[PDB]
Amino acid sequence: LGSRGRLWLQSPTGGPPPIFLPSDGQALVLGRGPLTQVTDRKCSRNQVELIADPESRTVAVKQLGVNPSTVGVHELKPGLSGSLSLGDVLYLVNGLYPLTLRWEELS
């Protein structure tokens, strides 16, 4: 359903604006900062690194932070990675601060 488009992360209602991911393969680090608006000290400023794949509509997520991120139903550890498909949630830290993967068409 739609060959060309951009992948982005949706925050809870009344949260930060859409976080669109580089469609060229470049990495995007997320964590405590103005992009996610998370101020929780348990969340790292470099919590996860994301690499988007628009063709498969998936996102690879590597944990860099000390405290556990959760990608779907898989809780990560530092150095480990999980995968997000459309509709899957990324919990930035300790089962909190969910970000849902969505797809915006160009047409």
Binding site: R41, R45, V66, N67
Partner: peptide, 7 residues
Amino acid sequence: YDESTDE
């Protein structure tokens, strides 16, 4: 945003 991370 600029604090050290907890544990």
